[PDB]
């Protein structure tokens, strides 16, 4: 619908060097806005998440590929801006922890409830929570979960399984790491076990690895998890192709897309960051990965199929869409590998924002769990971490910098982050609010009960 | 009368470890955006930097302060937020530079044009551009500059001065820096010179130092600056008594406040953050600095004087206040320094938008020139550059993190960041802009030509 509006051109004007040149925009946007707003209720969501997605990484990415004065025809288009919160909670004393990891990042937009991190779908009393997937189902809406990680992993997990901790993979691992959750010790199951029994229709994305561990206990005892799959009327897909041939997705044959043992591959390869790597090295230019392959689904594309198959039931539907890697190139100090992550989630915002622009009852959030390590500094910077510089879109160099951990590995961080809606309800995340917030305005957009 | 709410209170809004207590809103923000939205037009604009004030910045102020769940009754109260870009430019190519500094910055935001770091109203061929203060000034609109730094620092030096570089505080520094517009080379002046030329209504801050200085040439050669203004009337008050006492300030009447030779005294003392500093050593408390004075006028008072006296003023006003220190601070990695200047700007923004609030057709804009180092991270980081540990409102440790340099100095940073904005014109800020749409949102708002 012309009705709601998404910005088409926010992108410099002319001239950088000229007056007026750089601008972004072209007049007075509250009409603009005006027409952005609808206290309607929201048929269909879909939720984008760019793991460790902060403002930092954003621009060092629209820096990178489309320029300073570029514009992410996907991730700067929605209109509707605001910053969010999303400290966690310290097990022990209730109070706040700066710093929060995915588990309990990932559990405060999906069940609306701050907890501690490491933990998926529980409170700080250990106390499970419904999620917003298990909620949307019990309403009668279609349900998906895409992400390019392991479905085991933290992001995707808090929508379907309620355990004490993130590691809890499979019956192996929670058996030993949550023995309150595990199958036999009268638990709810490991990560991929309640993956199973939550059933949202569609479902894309790494991790196959942990499939093939076996039952320990319950009807499906000594099978693989796999097994039990299609066991349980389940169909399972591997590849670009047989994503695609995909006709229908829902209850009775429910998909599940296992796309790769681990984490699906990344878009880019770039070397490492290195201690004065901007000086003692020369700029760096992205390699795409040769390695990345037409057999596997990019996140646009199963973002598409998701969409697709969910928009087939009339009652309404609820997706999450995670952009995984960004987090994880960031934690290796991989420019490279981080941008073209950003990259690759721009291309499912844009699929994401076609659909709702269309459809006119979708609200789209595009969104960070927490912020990460990466900096962008001066070109002759000294640091005392991991450095890099780019050569950028506009012919220029750009250097990167990741300071916060001797470890091997780049920390998170707790800065406010962006967060932008588009569709009914998005004035919800304008302003100042909470990682919890999203939750409420979420289910409540819907008309959940 | 406040037609256009401000947000009175995004603190969490109960138990933040129990469901939905850690949320920032109570309902749907729909109508009251609606309500936040008017193209009519503004009789007065208060702008308000926090110089290196990014969402990291504000973030750790927060928790510190407020606590994680707290929220600032200034900072976080405006309802229209965004975030903007504010790359520079590279002299020679023309390119995009992307960390800018304070100088290219606030020439950006004054004059709607891209520059190089180091200028003041000018652009990259040198060319001299008009300042949104100038063009106030011009139309016949009460003027004001009040900042927490020396007058001559780029932020404040910006709206009326125009040198080739920052560096060119007073007719020494000019002959050797900038002889181009040296005084006695025929040039327009130093800083502090063009300044005494711009006679602003209102000029509140530090720098006392170099009215010290005498002209090479002109009409008061030879005679201080400080003399050169009182010969050409302007009202000399260097302490809060003084400054209270004034009751008018105009074209004949001008103010110049000139509270600390230097920059003016930071509000709370805390040591400098250290290698490995929030494991080696124990948590930092915060402490008032005895220096802070009650002969000395605060950022909120003279923020309040300001608005006083250019109030007066039928026609309007326009009135720029800088929080300078935070990012000096930052710079220092003095974290208690950094984040009690965050907490000073919250009070005078606090002024700002209660006589906004009151008034009507006010803008009011809160943002922030460039990003910088600070990084909150876990308590446990093991960290290559300085941290320190700090002991918060929630009775929680809070580790920051200082690691983009091995300089003496940390960096600025170039990530994108918050802007805010109240009253008419306010949906300018909203999406993605660059730091020089808002030169043309504020003429536009106030009508300029
Ligand atoms: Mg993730
Ligand atoms: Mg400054
Ligand atoms: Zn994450
Ligand atoms: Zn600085």
Known sequence: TPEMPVLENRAAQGDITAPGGARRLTGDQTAALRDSLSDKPAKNIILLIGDGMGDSEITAARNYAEGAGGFFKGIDALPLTGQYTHYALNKKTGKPDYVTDSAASATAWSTGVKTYNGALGVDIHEKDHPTILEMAKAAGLATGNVSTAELQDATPAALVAHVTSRKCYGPSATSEKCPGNALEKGGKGSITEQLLNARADVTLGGGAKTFAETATAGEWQGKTLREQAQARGYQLVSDAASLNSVTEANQQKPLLGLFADGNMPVRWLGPKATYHGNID???????????????????????????????????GFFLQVEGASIDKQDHAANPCGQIGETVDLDEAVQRALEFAKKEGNTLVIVTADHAHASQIVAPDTKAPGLTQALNTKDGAVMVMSYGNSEEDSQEHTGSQLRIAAYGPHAANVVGLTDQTDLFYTMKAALGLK
Chains 1, 2 share one sequence.
């Not at 390699?287 to 009339?314: C, F, G, H, Y």
Request: glycine content about 0%; overall charge positive; aromatic content about 0%.
């Open 281 to 315: 090295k020369p700029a760096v230019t992205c390699t795409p990965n040769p390695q990345r392959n037409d057999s596997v689904p990019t996140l646009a594309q199963m973002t598409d199929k998701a969409i697709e198959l969910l928009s087939k039931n009339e009652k």
